């Protein structure tokens, strides 16, 4: 029982040791920068062909190919430039909640309520796409899967544990324990040596891939966390929640920097993505319009309102040319 | 115009044709979601139907293909994955009548029924409710009074009144009584009765949906 109060003191110690470094808020630091207040984005392509809701999309490293997952049991690789379809992968489990596209472009990943992450081999001697490994070992449902490299994939489940897998062996290599609730999102640093996982416990945790230990813990959200994304520098990450609030945390400072909130928004956030420069924060919303937040000043530069139903998956290309927003209406839109 | 991407366009159109045909095949099947608290009821009802994640069972009755998604094994927060089943034709809910005295179980089943019935994703989804363990309820009701589970009950400890009271209690949870119909049935040892009841309910839901789209409702 003595441990409970001693831990409480340590929590107080963290707050005091971190209250000290909070000399000023970033709102004051950037009160003098020019506002980027004219961001009008028009739909450029309308990827069409899904027959049910879309829950995840991921861009390729080449900034042209994108993969979209849907509840109809199909994975489509789209050529963004010409609207063409490169492949149609029929999934074994129609319940897919995440999709990842390997950086090399050889493989794609999908997962969902089946509790299995499937790795597909895009480039084979035969013309069809085949499944290479069926990863198993999670009791809960898979929320997000991301590829560290051609052979290693990191995955988050709904049983409070995020895991890292070796594709060739098919066996779990490191287990990241410590969350008290369902984990919903994973974002990998540009160096691919750290990743941040956000859970339903309203806390975001920074892990280390090599040692499997929680390096830092961040809190401040009233409710669940649904999306997480790193800033390009890799020294900050933004998080989305169901209380209509986005926050920017710092890995080094250990504290909140800005709160992205507006009174008119009372809906949850389903996707958060950053722009190539880091000056635009693209946050998906359940009001049927994704919103472009200026990261440094917390003001809404612009709105994208081309969605019939709720925005679900949003991604920014590596080259920064386009922002693709998937939605439950079964249509993807490429917004430049 | 184009040089080698014309073949790519042909590939895209062929892929679109395959997806449309697959979508038609999927749309033909009727999807049912199975929920409950006691695993015994789920196992019995699944076995009665003609025949580690969520289990999908396929059975065909009267040339109508069915899909049943058992999500019992998924131990997680239900709110974050329940929305994936927004379009299901009907929800099959199983409750054990023999669990009224065992432990608070009946209260837990009522709580789950209230949670899913009034959820914002299933406003217009009919809920089929199966009360299992009828024979055990017959045997137990003679000795243990139904007063233990519901203090307010004032009735004879007989099967007909107790069963009617429990059904009335469960059917009273739906706050929205206009757009949703809670069909109730007591499970029978024969598989035929259960499958026929499910077929009647799903056909009624199909007719109601077709009328709703065409404006008559």
């Amino acid at each position: 029982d003595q441990l409970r109060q001693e831990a409480e003191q340590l929590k107080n110690q963290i707050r005091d040791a971190r209250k000290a470094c909070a000399d000023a808020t970033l709102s004051q630091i950037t009160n003098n920068i020019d506002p980027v207040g004219r961001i009008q984005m028009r739909t450029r392509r309308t990827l069409r062909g899904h027959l049910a809701k879309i829950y995840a999309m991921h861009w390729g490293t080449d900034s042209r190919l994108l993969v979209s997952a849907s509840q109809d049991g199909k994975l489509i690789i789209w050529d963004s430039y010409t609207t063409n379809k490169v492949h149609a992968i029929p999934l074994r489990s129609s319940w897919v909640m995440t999709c990842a596209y390997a950086p090399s472009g050889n493989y794609v990943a999908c997962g969902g309520l089946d509790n299995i992450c499937s790795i597909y081999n895009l480039k084979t001697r035969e013309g069809n796409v085949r499944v290479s490994r069926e990863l198993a070992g999670h009791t809960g449902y898979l929320s997000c899967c991301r590829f560290l490299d051609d052979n290693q994939i990191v995955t988050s489940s709904g049983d409070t544990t995020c895991a890292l897998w070796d594709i060739e062996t098919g066996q779990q290599t490191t287990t990241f324990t410590g969350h008290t609730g369902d984990v919903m999102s994973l974002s990998l640093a540009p160096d691919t040596r750290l990743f941040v996982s956000g859970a339903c416990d309203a806390s975001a945790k920074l892990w280390d891939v090599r040692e499997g230990m929680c390096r830092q813990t961040f809190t401040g959200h009233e409710s669940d966390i649904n999306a997480i994304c790193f800033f390009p520098n890799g020294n900050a990450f933004a998080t989305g929640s169901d209380d209509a609030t986005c926050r920017l945390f710092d890995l080094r400072a250990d504290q909140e920097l800005m709160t992205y909130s507006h009174d008119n928004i009372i809906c949850g956030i389903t996707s958060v993505s950053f722009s190539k420069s880091g000056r635009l924060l693209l946050a998906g919303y359940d009001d049927f319009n994704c919103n472009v937040w200026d990261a440094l000043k917390a003001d809404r530069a612009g709105v994208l309102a081309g969605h019939d139903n709720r925005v679900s998956c949003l991604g920014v290309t590596d080259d920064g040319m386009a922002v693709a927003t998937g939605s439950w209406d079964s249509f993807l839109k490429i917004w430049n | 115009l184009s040089a080698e991407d014309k073949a790519a366009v042909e590939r895209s159109k062929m892929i679109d044709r395959n997806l449309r045909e697959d979508g038609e095949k999927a749309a033909r099947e009727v999807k049912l979601l199975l929920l409950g608290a006691g695993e015994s009821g789920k196992s019995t009802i699944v076995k009665q139907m003609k025949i580690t994640g969520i289990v999908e069972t396929h059975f065909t009755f009267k040339d109508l293909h069915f899909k049943m998604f058992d999500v019992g094994a998924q131990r997680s927060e239900r709110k974050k994955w329940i929305h994936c089943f927004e379009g299901v034709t009907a929800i099959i809910f199983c409750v054990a009548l023999s669990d009224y005295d065992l432990v608070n179980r009946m209260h837990e089943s009522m709580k789950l029924f209230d949670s899913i019935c009034n959820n914002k994703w299933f406003t217009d989804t009919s809920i089929i409710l199966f009360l299992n363990k009828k024979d055990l309820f017959e045997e137990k009701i003679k000795k243990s009074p139904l007063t233990i589970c519901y203090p307010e009950y004032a009735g004879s400890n007989t099967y007909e009144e107790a069963a009617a009271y429990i059904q009335c209690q469960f059917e009273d949870l739906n706050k929205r009584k206009d757009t949703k119909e809670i069909y109730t049935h007591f499970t029978c040892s024969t598989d035929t009765k259960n499958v026929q009841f499910v077929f009647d309910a799903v056909t009624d839901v199909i007719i109601k949906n077709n009328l709703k789209d065409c404006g008559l409702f």
Epitope: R64, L65, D79, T82, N84, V86, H87, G105, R125, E126, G127, N128 | A3, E4, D5, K6, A7, A8, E10, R11, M14
Partner: single-chain antibody, 232 residues
Amino acid sequence: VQLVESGGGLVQPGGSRKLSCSASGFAFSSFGMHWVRQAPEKGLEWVAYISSGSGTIYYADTVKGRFTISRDDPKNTLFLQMTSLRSEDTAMYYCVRSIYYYGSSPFDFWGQGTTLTVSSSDIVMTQATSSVPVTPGESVSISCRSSKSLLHSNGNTYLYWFLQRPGQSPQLLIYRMSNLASGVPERFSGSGSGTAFTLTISRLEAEDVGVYYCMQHLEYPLTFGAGTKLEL
């Protein structure tokens, strides 16, 4: 992945014959299938092309109207119907598979081919040299010229390179002028600007000897180069 062809034999002039190619080891339905013939002691020339789904069929001008190409996807076989055979049609007919999508490698696999013997506008592609003296361990370059610029608006130059070892089917080396095919050693390298093209072998070995070919895929009919032979 193997393609074995059938139907080759002596045919009297003016007759008919049907060539059959059976495919095993890959998804035939999703691959476009080509027919390429090689006259004895001569270069390659395109004959026909049937796309996936039988939607689009193209024929070469020499054999237009008298040749019929058809595919039976359920049985995984490709059919070439030959009518009114003439002396010019004596050649070894090769069967090639091509799939077209972004990043694809067309003409990756070539069948063994069968010999057919008959008894007694287009983009020209020119290879300057018939033969070049080459010795093992030395870099060499093969040149290729085209009548019309091959750089399409997309930004892709539709040039393909091929190697035919003596007594074997042609094999793909470089596709789209800069991309190495699967299974080809890195020593092969290709570069081109506008119409002038070059293929470079950094270090040559015994297997590299053979006749090299050029292909253009910008427009139909597809045309091949005369053929550059490397001998040790």
